[PDB]
Structure 1
């Protein structure tokens, strides 16, 4: 079998055991990845803590140059990495190549953002005359060893979104990709290896999170945990973190509030784009439409027609709708579809599943009584919930324990801004679908959608600390 290895302390290492990866669309074996032992995890961490001081001792610009090299390498090999990524997570080929490209972009942005974090000089005289000669020189510092964990839908992108901001500031990294997507995670590891960062600065970990995950997170050598994945695991990590700092990017159930003065055609296209992207396997995605009854029939018919225009098929054919990541996922979605249907929702699209490929389905007349109204499906299923007032829309929206983003389709901005203030979310997009879009922008979620604020600059600030040196001037 094609056995991939972990990058540990400047070397590539296999383990006594391996995990075989298959393509979610065909079942074909892709290769295997190591199933690390806790002793091997200990060595990755011991390696990193050892290398940190010297990494931190480099100049900011030297660290940015290393990262620029990594990004340059990713661009060079984007078709290579993209071909395997496409196969490993059953995501269209072109979009797979786009993930790699977006990764290089965030690595290059974090590299230039990080060498520009400034410190402050504060005056004691601002607080008390007696301390007017006392000044504080405050400068940032790395937290130490950061553990980064990416999800299956963006194993590379959502790894680089953590690695670059961490490294530029002087921290060292321990990266653990998702098992289904670990081969791609190791292909990214190759770029860091070629760029030539000092041994121990960047390392990878592989094994089933359901088996060594608690171990790698509870390990006291870990100073910070940056995670992207399910709410349930985030809750776990939040506790396993203790008083240690963390950044969680969890579930989302983004709602699209459509008022009566919205451009329905523009609204229909955005909802379709955000709802069915990557078969609905996106955290920031319109997962429920709360529309005003008076415009609902018209919006729904447009959405209905558009759903029928989506392509369905294999990743290599760049189909809009591809097979879900695994059988358990497709089964879970089916149960949501069933609960809705059996409960009276109106399926405006055919319910059909072949293997783990579920055709896109539009559900009208969904009520707050159906599971599909609240639970994140992570499949191509979109519920339409008709409301009779903006206040109800807000009520139903905020009712969710999720609060990533939201879209408001209307032409009344001052009103749209008033609504946005009440929406318990991180970002509100006016007349656009939701998105992490433009990584210089803050990215955070409310309630059980996460902890911490991301976006390049915020990530950097979050994974650094401060060192205040106070003295008196004579």
Structure 2
């Protein structure tokens, strides 16, 4: 347990006050992180804007080199970092190390994607004959200062997924990790520091959201806000952003539509893996099964068999189901479970809770009057909602305020594509669980699920603008 420091203008800085961070699964004290003041935030942003001029005028090759070096150090330190990440957010140990490796893969991919950035030459003669000698040389430029806010459930992966695309394009960056997860974000920062990233190009901010939460987002120095977290926090960010560009990755309630001709064994396998991965603490998780009545009984029984095999225990033992992030999270999940039971749902697996470790709960015969049909639990509970027509399944799917992803299980792929067109989501996975991977694919959501398009090349594009130079050929 160390006293961790922020990276500020090439230096490691403590603050007057600090926040002690405990392992959710064991209460073990892991260390402290600084409680930055609003003025300390100003200093970070000031250092970053000063470094921006020299950073954006480097070559793409040179900026890519730092990112590649940082990714190499992350791979080297994957076990060290993953061990601490595992404790900090109660994530299975092996899964935590895999998160660090995936972050390195994304950083390397972003570097090589961004370095081949291309512009366009537009012909005035495409629009009016009199301007045929006028051409526009359109080149990309960084937006400036990117504020990256990562989430507790991917405190390294969804930090690097923001940082690396921003840096390659010439942006400078300030990372605000979640307090629960700030140790992991600082451990990611060290790899960038050791890679030699110039002073102020990349910095970190830590503190409680009461002191600095709104402040870091409102600050006029910030040119882009890239956030992953809860919908209510993300909606608040949208207001404070003003005219500034944003990327928001918010909640989800992904539907898994199972038609009558589906491969029920494949459906059940994917639904359980996607729904209960990391105890259901993921935006891109199967969170409601919309199953045609004719196959519902059998599908529910095969899902139940797989849920009962999920291990329930501690992160260090690589348990499928680990304790939730904090007591409020599990209290909210328990309330949803109770509301379903009170309204008549069938508990195919039994609710149990020891501390914040909730056993995986599978409900059948869930109806739309139950909170569990709509509210995102961020816990290990899955509702099965029976439907009688595919039109009903589409309407119930679309009635959700969320629209991140959806799955369609069916052997009729032309019909599945037609269904996909009508779903109000970013991505539809056919005969597979929802997921944001592979990380080159676009990742986005409709409605309250957020704004902007992620995925590596899409993040790069989102965090750049264009500069047009127009002249007349003579």
The answer, yes or no, to whether TM exceeds 0.5 is yes
Instruction: Please say if 1:250 is aligned against 2:250.
Output: yes
Q: Measure the CA separation in 2 of the matches of 1:122 and 1:60.
A: 23
**Partner of residue 118, structure 1:** 118
Secondary structure of the structure 2 residue equivalent to 1:216: helix
Q: After the TM superposition, list the runs of 4 or more consecutive aligned residues in structure 1 that deviate by more than 2 angstroms.
A: none
> What is the CA-CA distance between 1:351 and the residue it aligns to?
1.1
Q: Measure the CA separation in 1 of the matches of 2:46 and 2:222.
A: 10
Q: Measure the CA separation in 2 of the matches of 1:105 and 1:209.
A: 30
**Partner of residue 160, structure 2:** 160
Q: Measure the CA separation in 1 of the matches of 2:463 and 2:41.
A: 22
> What is the CA-CA distance between 1:428 and the residue it aligns to?
0.1
**Partner of residue 90, structure 1:** 90
TM-superposition CA deviations, 1:369-409 (whole Å, max 9, x none)? 00000000010000000000000000000000000000000
TM-superposition CA deviations, 1:343-392 (whole Å, max 9, x none)? 10000111100000000010000000000000000100000000000000
Q: Measure the CA separation in 1 of the matches of 2:12 and 2:398.
A: 48
> What is the CA-CA distance between 1:116 and the residue it aligns to?
1.1
Show the 5 A alignment for 1:395-434: 395-434=395-434
Instruction: Please say if 1:456 is aligned against 2:428.
Output: no
TM-superposition CA deviations, 1:303-327 (whole Å, max 9, x none)? 1111110001000000000000000
Show the 5 A alignment for 1:7-406: 7-406=7-406
Q: Measure the CA separation in 2 of the matches of 1:335 and 1:164.
A: 39
**Partner of residue 5, structure 1:** 5
Q: Measure the CA separation in 1 of the matches of 2:69 and 2:385.
A: 48
Normalising by the residue count of structure 2, what TM-score does the alignment of the two structures yield?
Answer: 1.00
Secondary structure of the structure 2 residue equivalent to 1:174: strand
Contact in 1 for aligned 2:37/2:211 (Cα 8 Å) = no
Q: Measure the CA separation in 1 of the matches of 2:265 and 2:224.
A: 45
Secondary structure of the structure 2 residue equivalent to 1:90: coil
Secondary structure of the structure 2 residue equivalent to 1:173: strand
Q: Measure the CA separation in 2 of the matches of 1:253 and 1:210.
A: 28
TM-superposition CA deviations, 1:440-473 (whole Å, max 9, x none)? 1000000110100010001000100000000001
TM-superposition CA deviations, 1:99-130 (whole Å, max 9, x none)? 00000000000000001121000100000000
Q: Measure the CA separation in 2 of the matches of 1:339 and 1:350.
A: 14
TM-superposition CA deviations, 1:187-236 (whole Å, max 9, x none)? 00100110001100000000012431100000000000000001111111
Q: Measure the CA separation in 2 of the matches of 1:60 and 1:347.
A: 56
Contact in 1 for aligned 2:38/2:211 (Cα 8 Å) = no
Q: Measure the CA separation in 2 of the matches of 1:5 and 1:166.
A: 23
Secondary structure of the structure 2 residue equivalent to 1:140: strand
> What is the CA-CA distance between 1:262 and the residue it aligns to?
0.3
> What is the CA-CA distance between 1:17 and the residue it aligns to?
0.3
TM-superposition CA deviations, 1:134-182 (whole Å, max 9, x none)? 0000000000000000000000000000000000000000000000000
Q: Measure the CA separation in 2 of the matches of 1:38 and 1:334.
A: 37
Secondary structure of the structure 2 residue equivalent to 1:308: helix
Q: Measure the CA separation in 1 of the matches of 2:346 and 2:302.
A: 15
Secondary structure of the structure 2 residue equivalent to 1:366: coil
Normalising by the residue count of structure 1, what TM-score does the alignment of the two structures yield?
Answer: 1.00
Q: Measure the CA separation in 2 of the matches of 1:161 and 1:412.
A: 35
Q: Measure the CA separation in 2 of the matches of 1:218 and 1:333.
A: 32
Contact in 1 for aligned 2:263/2:410 (Cα 8 Å) = yes
Q: Measure the CA separation in 2 of the matches of 1:150 and 1:264.
A: 36
Q: Measure the CA separation in 1 of the matches of 2:28 and 2:247.
A: 35
> What is the CA-CA distance between 1:2 and the residue it aligns to?
2.0
